Design a binder for this molecule. Structure first.
Ligand SMILES: [Cl-]
Ligand SMILES: [Mn+2]
Ligand SMILES: [Mn+2]
Lengths: 294, 35
């Protein structure tokens, strides 16, 4: 599989105005899916990672923003990356987005990591754009191929035993990290349970303990839940994504949780900045924020 | 007695170095919601 050629073609369109598509061949993409799938399974479902690295929230097919992020953060392998999920749906270029991410996973498997978000699920991306994009630009068979790949993505990450990372947030069923490790891949995302929550839950300032979620799926959780969780597991910080926030990042429960969202001007419907979080060797954390020049 | 393991701690920089900004030219047709 010619990974360098795939990557070269994907990066080739940087600086284009208007933004072009990159149309890989069907077999190139199937290759990306199949080879990345093997790597996902050969690595733990709960990743254990070391700083320094850069952490990104939702992309949702905003491919040129992804290139912007890499341009400023440093293209692999110049920097290590952990993405929190939601690569596809809503945006114009889900295909270029997921392909570049899978390509980097295969090229730098020890320095580049992808978590599963709730949109890396067939029941979800059938509805929110990715299915249509595949059907329009390739075929439905390719969509199913991605699905098999997504079903093997890891679910959570812990950076140097101190930063717990996942797409959505906490679960009332989460008592031990071992429960996460025990989850078998490939798997779909169920309508309920630990896996659901990790991909779907939200922090909420006005709830005490666990509340119902307006998404109609999973739960909300409050500041005390966060405190007890960090204390119980000897962690300092929860890093999650999943909700668009105005500054690209947002603190919760003092600075015990942060929400990251990396797609600026999200799907043309929001005036949010996009942010990534840089974690240095010592776990000093800071934000690199993408916003309009105006 | 037996020495303790090295531990890292999450910290944040002084308040002027927490955020660094980079800019893009906003094209209003670049981002859409396909749904
Ligand atoms: Cl609470
Ligand atoms: Mn999302
Ligand atoms: Mn999400």
């Amino acid at each position: 599989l010619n990974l360098d050629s795939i990557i070269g073609r994907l990066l080739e369109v940087q600086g284009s105005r208007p933004g072009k598509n990159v149309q890989l061949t069907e077999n190139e993409i199937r290759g990306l899916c199949l080879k990345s799938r093997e790597i996902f399974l050969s690595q733990p479902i709960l990743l254990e990672l070391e700083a320094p690295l850069k952490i990104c929230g939702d992309i949702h097919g905003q491919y040129y923003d992804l290139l912007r992020l890499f341009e400023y953060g440093g293209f692999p392998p110049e920097s290590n990356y952990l993405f929190l999920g939601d690569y596809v749906d809503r945006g114009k270029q889900s295909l270029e987005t997921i392909c570049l991410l899978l390509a980097y996973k295969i090229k730098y498997p020890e320095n580049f990591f992808l978590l599963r978000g709730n949109h890396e699920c067939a029941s979800i991306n059938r509805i929110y754009g990715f299915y249509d994009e595949c059907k329009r630009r390739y075929n439905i068979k390719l969509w199913k191929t991605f699905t098999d790949c997504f079903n093997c993505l890891p679910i959570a990450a812990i950076v140097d035993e101190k930063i717990f990372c996942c797409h959505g947030g906490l679960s009332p069923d989460l008592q031990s990290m071992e429960q996460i490790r025990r989850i078998m891949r490939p798997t779909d995302v169920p309508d309920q349970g630990l896996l659901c929550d990790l991909l779907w839950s939200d922090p909420d300032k006005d709830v005490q303990g666990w509340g119902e979620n307006d998404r109609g799926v999973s739960f909300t959780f409050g500041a005390e839940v966060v405190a007890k969780f960090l204390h119980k597991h000897d962690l300092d910080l929860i890093c999650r994504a999943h909700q668009v926030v105005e500054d690209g990042y947002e603190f919760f429960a003092k600075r015990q949780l942060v929400t990251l969202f990396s797609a600026p001007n999200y799907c043309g419907e929001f005036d949010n900045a996009g942010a990534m979080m840089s974690v240095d060797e010592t776990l000093m954390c800071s934000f690199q924020i993408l916003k309009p020049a105006d | 007695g037996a020495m303790g393991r090295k531990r890292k701690t999450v910290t944040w920089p002084e308040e002027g170095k927490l955020r660094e900004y980079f800019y893009f030219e906003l094209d209003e047709t670049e981002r859409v919601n396909v749904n």
